[PDB]
Amino acid sequence: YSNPRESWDMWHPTLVAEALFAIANIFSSLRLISLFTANSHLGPLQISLGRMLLDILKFLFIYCLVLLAFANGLNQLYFYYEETKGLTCKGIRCEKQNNAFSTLFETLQSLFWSIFGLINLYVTNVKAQHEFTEFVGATMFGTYNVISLVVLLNMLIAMMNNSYQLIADHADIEWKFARTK
């Protein structure tokens, strides 16, 4: 395969090479964190973050269960209302959000981004006038937001607090062991 750039297919080998180089670059530029065990002022800090990253993953499993539950519930609600209408863009990543809870992939993406507030509130109403389904979808969306933005995040903060309180005493010997390695 050796033409304007917009005519390229979405799975062109050069575009895949571009994206894989980008991900390899964000993985290569994070290796300087491993270079920070030698420094005395912040080596224990980096070591402590490395300790409680495992507990972070421990809690992210529970988050993944909650995310799957609410995502497939919202998909089972809204996917009967799939529409195209010849729109310029579909999905959450448009100027105007549409078909957010359309498929399971789009629902998982839309519920993930709702933690950071980048999904507006006009995704819960349908273009039709079925008010009851709109209300129960907005209720499910608000319930998941309440969970993953009040319950689970603050549980994560308190659990991180106790974990760093526990590993603050053993941070020095851990940093010395990592620096000797």
Binding site: L65, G73, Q76
Partner: protein, 53 residues
């Protein structure tokens, strides 16, 4: 709804409080609860148990 309402029309033509819409809404609520039931399976694990407890 299967016994009573079988009028061939588009989905947007229906009433807001039709039994089919209520049935799918309660089905979605039941699905959220069914998928959230899996938290009580985590207690048998030696890793995810104490955190959920």
């Amino acid at each position: 709804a299967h016994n009573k309402f079988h009028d061939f029309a588009d989905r947007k033509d229906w009433d807001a409080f039709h039994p089919t819409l209520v049935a799918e809404g309660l089905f979605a609520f039941a699905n959220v609860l069914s998928y959230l039931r899996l938290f009580f399976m985590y207690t048998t694990s030696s890793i995810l148990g104490p955190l959920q407890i």
